Design a binder for this molecule. Structure first.
Ligand code: INO
Ligand code: INO
Ligand code: INO
Ligand code: INO
Ligand code: FE
Ligand code: FE
Ligand code: FE
Ligand code: FE
Lengths: 233, 200, 233, 200, 233, 200, 200
């Protein structure tokens, strides 16, 4: 079984978005009013599932083939998963989901008038390698209008979920594309108070990773809570 | 002071979380292997239980787009981290609430006891992470059982909750679903009877 | 017939791109080596066609309908045509052409591996109104790899052709999208030496012109050579 | 000094110019009304001629993706600016070179004489704008006719070209295509026999 | 035999000197007028020789001993060869040649009036180690007059040739010495448009690697094209 | 965007390049092991050939201080990267032009066919890198054989050169030297008949 | 992005708003022509009704210094924008709550059906803007009638409110005052039963 041999750097709750961020409407009624109760780390929190044995399909990470070819800007999204100490996070589960080129999601509840792409699903999963590297191949999603304010549009973005070594490191985030003018206008993006934190969410154009005459590439590194050994406990 | 690299900021999971982490619910085709709500196979040691609940927002309305992840010890109080669909029991699982009634369910076994870092036993518990649209950063909670009153009273974690009335929000109520042992754990995100959520 | 009653401000050939800009390969062999011969304006140059009577179709300016619905980011491209003096250019012909959402053009010669969109043509034309306003509805084109350097990608762009009042004002240009990180890397964009001139080519996000829950909008104004009356000639 | 608003910068037309300005060539369906290479209808006054040419790059190779726009006076030396497909004659037209042989053609009438701003007559001429991939800003030229030698010699515009040998680059050579009057005007963009291009 | 497993980052032809740089007189007739033709990388370009079995003599990298003692400033030139990703390039061939302490080359065609040094040849070779390190022992070359403009002097320099993993990485360069006042006046140096690029060619004094009471040292690191594994091809 | 460390900038090899890379030519004593112009030992398999050519500047004058490096597959279409003076065949070699007549020579075998990244076979070819004073960054080119017309016509590489006339600048002309198979490959750096140079 | 001139920022109407917009209420002499609470002249067509209601703060206390403005269609589903004291019906009116009991009243007619931008009919409704001290920017809401359940169930507007329970806060309850048809519409600004407020 898993064992309690690690401690994780305490989360900085002023870096992450706060629970109540009124401009993002839904958060009003979906935010606790009582303070979170701080508890010491134990095996319950310092352990988590290892996905090394899940049976991954051949195109689990290739959105171009996992669902013709989809219409849109062919891109590769690649990056590394490291911890706060700069240490790679090997054999970790990276899952992603996004809209199509037009901003339509392949989900029951999506009523946006832009059409579905017959050759596009929107889901990918990849286990990072020994160096903490992951990569996916997909199409760049389009902006998506949503019922927040009367004229609110989400910047193009890809939803990401990363497991890490324990339930303590587990994270759900969103990637944004370098230069998108909608970024600074999004109430969800703005849930994050430090402009410096926002920058961590922006995937950078990566010409070095692009496939000439084929597809472009974006670089997106993810930092998980720092893992240290217990001492003097 | 020393500053490490900043952790990547959390973002809400959004309303379409299902297309990525709960394919069936999304109404999409699933892959060969998927992480779902069945932690134990019938031939798994321990007391087989069914967990079920609803999630309420601050207005008393059901959150029908919530997504939950669970982490628990097997019946022998051990965390089985090597996730595999062949396993009789997996310590990890996922569930979501129905767009209809809005109830999540999980098929598992009552977890054994585990000790905190100081060597003190904790009452049997299931660790839960809640994700949904409107939730900027996932909420952490624990599910304890009303039938473990003696253990619950001595839990070093439960005891950290200053007000005893607040501790009660963490206790699942034993019941039976189609004459099978079940425990109901409803989560109140905000307001009256608001569920305790932790930071760790 | 047309009459010689106007003079046009002389073009600033240092503002426009030069003929020979070696990084853009094709220009090497397609640029004159002899100096352009300056000639005085006459009726031949100060006149041009008026397109007021061309028979425009109902969806000539609507790329969403002029060719299902196309897949991609629904946008409205609108703006005004003025001259150097700030004077509107009414009843002028604005024509445009672009790639699809994936960067594929509906042209014989286009071999890019991204697929054609069955519901997308790529051509639009609009006559400006009394105030010099034009508008089009389309999908935002994707970047397009081309055989220049080994890894050259055109920023997403829409080709524009504007008639103006004479053959003297006639212009062919390209619109780029605000924030696109490929802009500063394009050898064609870089044919233009003044960074200030480059900025004139960037369409700005226009939230005020957007159709809530429907499509976004980009603003692109075009300035034609200034028209003055002849004096003391 | 006084500075006005800057004019929008030119950009090459690119290789796909045809999808936008020459639909047929693009290999695409055309609209009801299109601006093409037939300036005059059979019943139009004037001497009906066929113009044709090739465009060469600096290496002596054909530019098969070129796009051209023409502006000329009718037979009475008048500029007909109200473009209409019903007109017996339109002063404006468009043509392009074939991806095969790479020759453009235009069906028109020999233009009448027009005076420059100083009241001096100019030799009959067709104004041409050339666009293509590799051309940052369109090139301006004029097409004069070899059979108008007397008028050509007195042209105030031709006379502005310092070297007489350069003037010859602007003269179309009269010929016959299927026993019909035609004039060939080849454009050399760069190099030996490079065509005069103007700035105005 | 060699295998097509890598891709090399496309070269930045605006970083390196351009072919035609008129102040460097000889480049006028020795530079192509046609644009280079871009081609996709194949086994032909992504492979190259491995010099691991070349039989190097014991003093191949020691110019003090490979040809009495040479007259001149005894120095060690050492550094490391890395790729653009900052990864060492082990067992790669580094070759160098240079003039004597006086600016005279031991070459037929060198008629400069400064005499040859009976104990100095001016050639060296070294195969980088496991860490991408190389080192030579020589004497500091003197500036050399050349028939470019009427009073042109090459700053003291050492010529370098580096193989790397493929013919795609092979490079020839020159090393310059920290603070030499001639650097900024040289037309060959000036062939490099970016002053930042010039800086990479300057060896820095390195007191740490010096042998007290014996010789000084200069540090010269070399960066070859970034090597990456192929992906989604 | 992501910016990596910049690559060290190229510099001309200069006129004295032989001192370092062509010891004999410089008229200096060589070392025990030198990389030279004989890729194949007389007993190497394949069709043994002799390559020779001149290099001309933009004025048509011979470039007598040029240095060349070659990379080619063996007769089996194989790249032999482990360089060793003992091998019967080496994929890599070096040559330089004479300060006299100014002609380089190489002794090798005709290369077998290799496939491009897409799996399409390329015509037999020798990759060449040219260095010399006045050349800031070395020039890349390929040598094809005139007796492989069939293959040359289908090469994905030759086929990337827009103009057919330019493809011809890469074809070596078969001959015979002392009843020995030879191919002459002249390089024109600039001007009339200028050789195709690559970027990769 | 394109930035337009910013709109002048809103400010609370303050406690003395009546001096300017409800002269009588302020207990001041009015002018010849005043915009008040009687939209329809007793002889106006349609079903004449009387509207009344209270406004509560977050503590459940009455808001006695509030000012309201209404905009509604006439009985034919028509907006009568040309305001005139002579018309039998005016689409616009003003009302305010009593410094005593604190109840507002309006005398009008039941509005006819109007279609939304998409062409779908909305249930009969009265648009309301609420102003008062403590209110920085006025609040928008709509008044629906409980006797039009059928229509209300299909309103595209009511249907935009996620939660059904919240839709109910917009429905006025039919009654009778002196044998006169009346509908009571209470506004709860904050808390329990808080009224739905719009943004448009
Ligand atoms: O929180 C939401 O409402 C929301 C809507 C749409 N998208 O795309 C999201 O990512 C989040
Ligand atoms: O000049 C060119 O080669 C070129 C290629 C592709 N696009 O899209 C352009 O606009 C221009
Ligand atoms: O290119 C040349 O002419 C030149 C002359 C002398 N040195 O020392 C060089 O390195 C280059
Ligand atoms: O909101 C208030 O209480 C207030 C009081 C007095 N004045 O003059 C205002 O304008 C507002
Ligand atoms: Fe989303
Ligand atoms: Fe284009
Ligand atoms: Fe030198
Ligand atoms: Fe006041």
């Amino acid at each position: 079984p898993a064992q309690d041999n690690s401690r994780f750097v305490i989360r900085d709750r002023n870096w992450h978005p706060k629970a109540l961020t009124p401009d993002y409407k839904t958060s009003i009624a979906r935010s606790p009013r009582q303070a979170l109760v701080s508890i010491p780390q134990s095996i319950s929190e310092t352990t988590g599932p290892n996905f090394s044995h899940l049976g991954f399909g051949a195109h689990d990470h290739d959105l171009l083939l996992n669902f013709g070819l989809p219409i849109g800007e062919r891109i590769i999204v690649a990056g590394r998963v490291v911890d706060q100490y700069g240490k790679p996070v090997p054999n970790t589960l990276v899952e992603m989901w996004q809209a199509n080129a037009g901003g339509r999601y392949r989900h029951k509840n999506d009523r946006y008038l832009a059409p579905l792409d017959p050759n596009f699903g929107g889901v990918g999963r990849c286990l990072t390698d020994s160096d903490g590297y992951y990569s996916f191949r997909t199409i760049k999603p389009g902006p998506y209008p949503w019922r927040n304010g009367p004229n609110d549009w989400r910047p193009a973005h890809i939803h990401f979920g990363i497991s890490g070594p324990s339930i303590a490191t587990k994270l759900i985030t969103q990637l944004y594309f370098e230069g998108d003018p909608l970024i600074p206008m999004c109430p969800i993006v703005k849930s994050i108070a430090n402009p410096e934190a926002v920058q961590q969410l922006i995937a950078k154009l990566d010409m070095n990773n692009a496939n000439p005459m084929d597809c472009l590439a974006y670089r997106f590194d993810i930092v998980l809570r720092g893992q240290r050994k217990t001492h003097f406990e | 002071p020393i500053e490490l690299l900043p952790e990547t900021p959390s973002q809400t999971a959004g309303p379409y979380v299902h297309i990525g982490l709960a394919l069936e619910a999304a109404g999409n085709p699933t892959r060969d292997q998927e992480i779902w709500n069945r932690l134990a196979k019938p031939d798994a040691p321990g007391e087989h239980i069914l967990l079920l609940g609803q999630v309420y927002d601050g207005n008393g309305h059901l959150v029908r787009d919530s997504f939950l992840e669970v982490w628990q010890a097997d019946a022998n109080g051990e965390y089985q981290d090597a996730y595999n669909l062949e396993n009789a029991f997996n310590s990890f699982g996922r569930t979501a609430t129905t767009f209809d009634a809005g109830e999540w369910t999980l098929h598992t076994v009552k977890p054994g006891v585990v000790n905190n870092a100081a060597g003190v036993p904790m009452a049997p518990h299931i660790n839960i992470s809640l994700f949904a649209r409107g939730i900027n950063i996932h909420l952490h909670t624990r599910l304890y059982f009303d039938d473990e009153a003696q253990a619950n009273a001595k839990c070093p974690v439960l005891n950290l909750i200053e007000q005893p009335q607040r501790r009660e929000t963490l206790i699942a109520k034993r019941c039976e679903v189609d004459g099978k042992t079940a425990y109901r754990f409803d989560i109140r995100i905000q307001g009256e009877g608001e569920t305790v959520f932790f930071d760790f």
